[PDB]
Design a protein around this ligand. Structure first.
Ligand SMILES: Nc1nc(=O)c2cc(CNc3ccc(C(=O)N[C@@H](CCC(=O)O)C(=O)O)cc3)cnc2[nH]1
Ligand SMILES: NCC(=O)N[C@@H]1O[C@H](COP(=O)([O-])[O-])[C@@H](O)[C@H]1O
Length: 209
Protein backbone atom coordinates (compact mmCIF):
# COMPACT_ATOMS: atom_id res chain seq x y z
CA UNK A 1 0.00 0.00 0.00
CA UNK A 2 1.29 3.40 -1.17
CA UNK A 3 1.01 6.32 1.10
CA UNK A 4 2.04 9.87 0.13
CA UNK A 5 2.27 12.60 2.77
CA UNK A 6 1.97 16.31 2.38
CA UNK A 7 3.84 18.58 4.79
CA UNK A 8 4.54 22.31 5.26
CA UNK A 9 7.10 22.16 8.08
CA UNK A 10 8.96 20.16 10.78
CA UNK A 11 7.83 16.65 9.92
CA UNK A 12 7.52 14.99 13.33
CA UNK A 13 4.17 13.29 12.41
CA UNK A 14 5.75 12.21 9.04
CA UNK A 15 8.64 10.70 11.01
CA UNK A 16 6.25 8.60 13.09
CA UNK A 17 4.52 7.32 9.93
CA UNK A 18 7.95 6.40 8.43
CA UNK A 19 9.00 4.53 11.58
CA UNK A 20 5.75 2.58 11.84
CA UNK A 21 5.98 1.59 8.17
CA UNK A 22 9.57 0.52 8.76
CA UNK A 23 8.58 -1.76 11.62
CA UNK A 24 5.60 -2.99 9.79
CA UNK A 25 3.18 -1.68 12.32
CA UNK A 26 1.67 -0.06 9.13
CA UNK A 27 1.45 -2.83 6.31
CA UNK A 28 2.45 -0.27 3.72
CA UNK A 29 5.12 2.35 2.78
CA UNK A 30 5.65 6.12 2.20
CA UNK A 31 6.42 6.58 -1.52
CA UNK A 32 6.73 10.37 -1.70
CA UNK A 33 6.67 13.48 0.57
CA UNK A 34 5.32 16.73 -0.93
CA UNK A 35 5.98 20.21 0.58
CA UNK A 36 4.75 23.71 -0.38
CA UNK A 37 7.62 25.18 1.57
CA UNK A 38 11.16 24.84 0.34
CA UNK A 39 12.64 25.07 3.77
CA UNK A 40 10.44 22.35 5.39
CA UNK A 41 12.59 20.20 7.67
CA UNK A 42 10.31 17.20 6.98
CA UNK A 43 11.84 17.00 3.49
CA UNK A 44 15.25 16.34 5.11
CA UNK A 45 13.63 13.58 7.25
CA UNK A 46 12.16 12.02 4.01
CA UNK A 47 15.49 12.39 2.29
CA UNK A 48 17.49 10.71 5.05
CA UNK A 49 14.97 7.80 4.93
CA UNK A 50 15.35 7.49 1.20
CA UNK A 51 11.84 8.69 0.22
CA UNK A 52 11.20 10.88 -2.83
CA UNK A 53 10.95 14.57 -2.14
CA UNK A 54 8.96 17.22 -4.02
CA UNK A 55 8.57 20.96 -3.40
CA UNK A 56 5.81 22.73 -5.21
CA UNK A 57 5.79 26.53 -4.55
CA UNK A 58 2.43 28.25 -5.26
CA UNK A 59 3.94 31.65 -6.05
CA UNK A 60 4.52 30.08 -9.44
CA UNK A 61 0.91 29.07 -10.17
CA UNK A 62 -1.41 32.17 -10.70
CA UNK A 63 -4.54 30.25 -9.41
CA UNK A 64 -5.66 27.92 -6.58
CA UNK A 65 -7.34 25.52 -8.92
CA UNK A 66 -4.18 25.55 -10.99
CA UNK A 67 -1.76 24.74 -8.21
CA UNK A 68 -3.96 21.87 -7.15
CA UNK A 69 -4.03 20.34 -10.61
CA UNK A 70 -0.24 20.18 -10.83
CA UNK A 71 -0.18 18.70 -7.31
CA UNK A 72 -2.76 16.04 -8.34
CA UNK A 73 -0.62 15.36 -11.45
CA UNK A 74 2.57 14.73 -9.46
CA UNK A 75 1.01 12.76 -6.62
CA UNK A 76 -0.57 10.32 -8.95
CA UNK A 77 2.84 9.28 -10.39
CA UNK A 78 3.27 7.46 -7.04
CA UNK A 79 -0.12 5.90 -7.32
CA UNK A 80 -1.26 6.61 -3.73
CA UNK A 81 -3.72 4.37 -1.91
CA UNK A 82 -4.12 6.99 0.76
CA UNK A 83 -2.79 10.57 0.79
CA UNK A 84 -2.14 12.00 4.18
CA UNK A 85 -2.01 15.59 5.29
CA UNK A 86 0.46 15.99 8.19
CA UNK A 87 1.00 19.68 8.86
CA UNK A 88 -0.03 20.91 5.39
CA UNK A 89 -0.93 24.59 5.56
CA UNK A 90 -3.31 25.15 2.56
CA UNK A 91 -6.98 24.84 1.85
CA UNK A 92 -7.42 22.25 -0.84
CA UNK A 93 -9.90 22.97 -3.48
CA UNK A 94 -13.07 20.99 -4.20
CA UNK A 95 -11.40 19.26 -7.07
CA UNK A 96 -8.48 17.96 -5.02
CA UNK A 97 -10.79 16.83 -2.27
CA UNK A 98 -13.13 15.31 -4.85
CA UNK A 99 -10.26 13.44 -6.44
CA UNK A 100 -8.91 11.87 -3.33
CA UNK A 101 -12.41 11.36 -1.89
CA UNK A 102 -12.27 8.54 0.71
CA UNK A 103 -8.53 8.33 0.84
CA UNK A 104 -7.69 11.79 2.08
CA UNK A 105 -6.82 12.07 5.79
CA UNK A 106 -5.80 14.91 8.14
CA UNK A 107 -4.74 15.53 11.71
CA UNK A 108 -6.14 18.70 13.33
CA UNK A 109 -4.90 19.86 16.85
CA UNK A 110 -8.22 20.36 18.67
CA UNK A 111 -11.10 18.27 20.03
CA UNK A 112 -13.38 18.71 17.06
CA UNK A 113 -15.77 20.30 16.57
CA UNK A 114 -14.24 22.69 19.00
CA UNK A 115 -11.50 24.81 17.43
CA UNK A 116 -11.75 24.17 13.68
CA UNK A 117 -9.17 26.70 12.37
CA UNK A 118 -5.68 27.93 13.16
CA UNK A 119 -4.32 28.95 16.59
CA UNK A 120 -6.30 26.17 18.41
CA UNK A 121 -3.75 25.80 21.28
CA UNK A 122 -3.95 29.55 22.00
CA UNK A 123 -7.77 29.26 21.92
CA UNK A 124 -7.64 26.39 24.46
CA UNK A 125 -5.34 28.34 26.69
CA UNK A 126 -7.34 31.60 26.46
CA UNK A 127 -10.72 30.00 27.05
CA UNK A 128 -9.28 28.32 30.16
CA UNK A 129 -10.16 24.80 29.01
CA UNK A 130 -9.49 21.86 31.26
CA UNK A 131 -8.98 19.49 28.50
CA UNK A 132 -7.33 19.94 25.10
CA UNK A 133 -6.67 17.28 22.35
CA UNK A 134 -6.12 16.24 18.81
CA UNK A 135 -8.36 14.80 16.06
CA UNK A 136 -7.81 12.53 13.07
CA UNK A 137 -10.49 12.99 10.42
CA UNK A 138 -11.42 12.30 6.77
CA UNK A 139 -10.94 15.56 4.73
CA UNK A 140 -14.06 16.99 3.12
CA UNK A 141 -14.87 20.33 1.38
CA UNK A 142 -15.91 21.79 4.74
CA UNK A 143 -12.71 23.15 6.37
CA UNK A 144 -11.65 21.00 9.29
CA UNK A 145 -15.14 19.50 9.35
CA UNK A 146 -15.00 16.03 7.73
CA UNK A 147 -16.01 12.85 9.84
CA UNK A 148 -13.80 12.34 12.91
CA UNK A 149 -12.08 8.99 13.34
CA UNK A 150 -10.08 9.29 16.51
CA UNK A 151 -9.36 11.92 19.12
CA UNK A 152 -6.88 11.87 21.99
CA UNK A 153 -7.61 14.36 24.90
CA UNK A 154 -4.84 16.02 26.90
CA UNK A 155 -4.93 18.10 30.18
CA UNK A 156 -4.23 21.77 30.00
CA UNK A 157 -2.91 22.96 33.34
CA UNK A 158 -2.16 26.42 34.79
CA UNK A 159 1.38 27.70 34.33
CA UNK A 160 1.08 26.17 30.91
CA UNK A 161 2.50 27.97 27.93
CA UNK A 162 1.47 27.39 24.28
CA UNK A 163 4.62 25.33 23.87
CA UNK A 164 3.76 23.04 26.67
CA UNK A 165 0.15 22.40 25.36
CA UNK A 166 1.71 22.01 21.88
CA UNK A 167 4.32 19.38 22.77
CA UNK A 168 1.85 17.47 24.95
CA UNK A 169 -0.65 17.30 22.03
CA UNK A 170 2.07 16.33 19.53
CA UNK A 171 2.94 13.27 21.64
CA UNK A 172 -0.56 11.98 21.20
CA UNK A 173 -0.50 12.70 17.47
CA UNK A 174 2.55 10.54 17.08
CA UNK A 175 0.65 7.69 18.53
CA UNK A 176 -2.84 7.94 17.14
CA UNK A 177 -2.03 8.97 13.49
CA UNK A 178 0.07 5.76 12.61
CA UNK A 179 -2.65 3.83 14.26
CA UNK A 180 -5.54 5.11 12.09
CA UNK A 181 -3.40 4.84 8.91
CA UNK A 182 -2.89 1.10 9.80
CA UNK A 183 -6.68 0.62 10.23
CA UNK A 184 -7.02 2.21 6.72
CA UNK A 185 -4.15 0.06 5.31
CA UNK A 186 -5.80 -3.13 6.69
CA UNK A 187 -9.15 -2.36 5.05
CA UNK A 188 -10.89 -1.77 8.35
CA UNK A 189 -11.56 1.95 7.95
CA UNK A 190 -13.87 3.43 5.32
CA UNK A 191 -15.87 6.61 4.64
CA UNK A 192 -19.45 6.13 3.20
CA UNK A 193 -20.35 9.78 2.68
CA UNK A 194 -19.95 11.92 5.69
CA UNK A 195 -19.77 8.82 7.95
CA UNK A 196 -16.51 7.14 9.06
CA UNK A 197 -16.97 3.31 9.47
CA UNK A 198 -14.61 1.10 11.56
CA UNK A 199 -15.09 -2.67 11.18
CA UNK A 200 -18.52 -2.22 9.55
CA UNK A 201 -19.72 -0.11 12.47
CA UNK A 202 -20.75 3.52 11.75
CA UNK A 203 -18.55 5.57 14.19
CA UNK A 204 -20.04 8.30 16.53
CA UNK A 205 -19.21 11.99 15.91
CA UNK A 206 -16.30 12.26 18.26
CA UNK A 207 -14.79 9.15 16.75
CA UNK A 208 -13.56 6.42 19.02
CA UNK A 209 -11.86 3.28 18.31
N1 LIG B 1 -10.74 21.35 1.87
C1 LIG B 1 -10.02 21.08 2.91
N2 LIG B 1 -10.62 20.59 3.96
C2 LIG B 1 -9.96 20.42 5.08
O1 LIG B 1 -10.63 20.01 6.03
C3 LIG B 1 -8.58 20.78 5.13
C4 LIG B 1 -7.80 20.41 6.29
C5 LIG B 1 -6.52 21.20 6.42
C6 LIG B 1 -6.92 22.48 7.12
N3 LIG B 1 -5.62 23.06 7.43
C7 LIG B 1 -5.38 24.37 7.31
C8 LIG B 1 -4.05 24.76 7.44
C9 LIG B 1 -3.64 26.01 7.03
C10 LIG B 1 -4.55 26.89 6.49
C11 LIG B 1 -4.10 28.21 6.12
O2 LIG B 1 -2.93 28.60 6.06
N4 LIG B 1 -5.08 29.02 5.76
C12 LIG B 1 -4.95 30.44 5.37
C13 LIG B 1 -4.22 30.59 3.96
C14 LIG B 1 -4.88 30.16 2.61
C15 LIG B 1 -4.70 28.68 2.28
O3 LIG B 1 -4.88 27.81 3.29
O4 LIG B 1 -4.49 28.29 1.14
C16 LIG B 1 -6.40 30.99 5.34
O5 LIG B 1 -6.77 32.02 4.76
O6 LIG B 1 -7.29 30.28 6.10
C17 LIG B 1 -5.89 26.50 6.37
C18 LIG B 1 -6.31 25.25 6.77
C19 LIG B 1 -5.78 21.41 5.09
N5 LIG B 1 -6.73 21.71 4.00
C20 LIG B 1 -7.98 21.30 4.01
N6 LIG B 1 -8.71 21.45 2.93
N1 LIG C 1 -5.05 21.85 10.50
C1 LIG C 1 -3.57 21.87 10.25
C2 LIG C 1 -2.56 21.86 11.43
O1 LIG C 1 -2.41 22.88 12.11
N2 LIG C 1 -1.93 20.71 11.76
C3 LIG C 1 -0.91 20.53 12.85
O2 LIG C 1 0.38 20.80 12.31
C4 LIG C 1 1.39 20.19 13.12
C5 LIG C 1 2.55 19.71 12.25
O3 LIG C 1 3.54 19.05 13.05
P1 LIG C 1 4.83 18.48 12.42
O4 LIG C 1 5.34 19.32 11.42
O5 LIG C 1 5.94 18.23 13.52
O6 LIG C 1 4.27 17.12 11.85
C6 LIG C 1 0.76 19.00 13.80
O7 LIG C 1 1.00 19.12 15.21
C7 LIG C 1 -0.71 19.09 13.34
O8 LIG C 1 -1.65 18.85 14.37
Amino acid sequence: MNIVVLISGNGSNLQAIIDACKTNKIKGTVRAVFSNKADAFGLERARQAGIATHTLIASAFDSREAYDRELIHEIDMYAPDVVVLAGFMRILSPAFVSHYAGRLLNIHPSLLPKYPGLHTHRQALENGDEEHGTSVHFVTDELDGGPVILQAKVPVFAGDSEDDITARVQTQEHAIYPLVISWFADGRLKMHENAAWLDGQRLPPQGYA
